[PDB]
């Protein structure tokens, strides 16, 4: 179909949006020089936080753990019972957290409500009652500091939650000491980031785990180090933690090359990070979150509209607005169909009132697969950097989130861009070394296989963190 002029600007775009081979092995490079530097004592834009976790599960774990995840609507509670042969069931229920509950003014109130919470599922599930305490972790995905698996110092709180008093405090006592109040015999012994969840409940069940990795709104990875080859940690580490002891580490990855050395930010991408809500940071996850993704291609179809090629005698009120297209914008184009693209006709149409012709959809198309393609391929630099730097030659990494999930094609794309990093030459992804699988879940299942680890250390007296706490 397509006219000379639109064709000269899809290839203009072609040539913004590609990222090469060369590209991607140039990013893990500094990738794995970033990681590094982070474990260092001197520290760096990554902050490669130590997550605690000082064993490898054996997958014979077994019995009644309990896990709780605090989200953003729901408060979630899961019975995890360890099967003892790689394998888990799970129990859970969601306790919808009032409207005013994420800003009360009474720092107790929201500890009350969790163990009221926790009461009341307890009843259902243990009519009996229960005699010897279960150990219970806690997924607290917002901002915090920890020197032990079983703290957590609220850094700042996050997602509208502003409540007084707890920042800069540790929340494992003030919901322990809510728990004590009803003569619950549950007993809190971790926190921990979802990711480092994901990490230790797929290795649980699949020994072949590597890596924990979400592919979200936010991007994050998780693996497992080894004590002796972190620098910051050095003679902060009690006697009973041998020098070959493997610890897990929450890399927070989304802040890598914030100093801009290395990624494809194209302009466009400096736009984005400009209008956001903190210019200059969380560089590799504007540059491979699926967060951004509509907005980018927003962006690069307002250029061509300015410029006189497409949306010609158009009314653009409701489309010249930043974030009016989320991920699924993008994700509804890729998938339209048939070659005349009618779906991205409806949605043009009835969304924003502008009306197409099928050369402007193929442009529009091949926009949010150079765009959806450039995502995929940037967010598994950190997978094979952290693949380099342990020396993985094979393995199963556990990925999670919701554009891994459900964004099209992110799978297939995800998996040939280790590929050509690699220079692999196998031809079906099921034959490829590193290989991206479902992961358990980190917020329930993981929260219970860590505490279920932790509950162990701290029975025999081990250490569980640095010498002080």
Known sequence: ?????????????????????????????????????????????????????????????????????????????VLVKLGGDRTFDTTQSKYRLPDAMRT?????????????????????????????????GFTFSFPASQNKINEGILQRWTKGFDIPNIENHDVVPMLQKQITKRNIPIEVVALINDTTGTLVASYYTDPETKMGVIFGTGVNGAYYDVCSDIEKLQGKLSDDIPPSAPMAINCEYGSF?????????????????????????????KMSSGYYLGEILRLALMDMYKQGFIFKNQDLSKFDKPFVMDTSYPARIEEDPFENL????????????????????????????????????????????????????????????????????????????????????????????????????????????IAALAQKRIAEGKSVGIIGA
């Open 104 to 136: 009360t003014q009474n720092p107790d109130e929201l500890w009350e409500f969790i163990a009221d919470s926790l009461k009341a599922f307890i009843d259902e599930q243990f009519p009996q009652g229960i005699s010897e305490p279960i150990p219970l």
């Open 257 to 285: 090359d914030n100093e801009h050395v290395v990624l494809p930010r194209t302009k466009y991408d400096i736009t984005i990070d400009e209008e956001s809500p903190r210019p200059g940071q969380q560089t590799f996850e």
């Open 1 to 77: 179909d397509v006219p000379k002029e639109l064709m000269q600007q899809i290839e203009n775009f072609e040539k913004i949006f590609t990222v090469p081979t060369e590209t991607l092995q140039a990013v893990t490079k500094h990738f794995i020089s970033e990681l590094e530097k982070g474990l260092s004592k001197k520290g760096g834009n990554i902050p490669m936080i130590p997550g605690w976790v000082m064993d490898f599960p054996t997958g014979k774990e077994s019995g009644d753990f309990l896990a709780i995840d605090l989200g953003g609507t729901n408060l979630r509670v």
């Open 342 to 449: 009618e779906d991205t006709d409806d949605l043009f149409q009835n969304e924003f009132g502008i009306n197409t012709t099928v050369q402007e959809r193929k442009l529009i198309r091949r926009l949010s697969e150079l765009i959806g393609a450039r995502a995929a391929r940037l967010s598994v630099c950190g997978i094979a950097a952290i693949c380099q730097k342990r020396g993985y030659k094979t393995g199963h990494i556990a990925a999670d989130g919701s554009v891994y999930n459900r964004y099209p094609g992110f799978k297939e794309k995800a998996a040939n861009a280790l590929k050509d990093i690699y220079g692999w030459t196998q031809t079906s992804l099921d034959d490829y070394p590193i290989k991206i699988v479902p992961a358990e879940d980190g917020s329930g299942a993981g929260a219970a296989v």
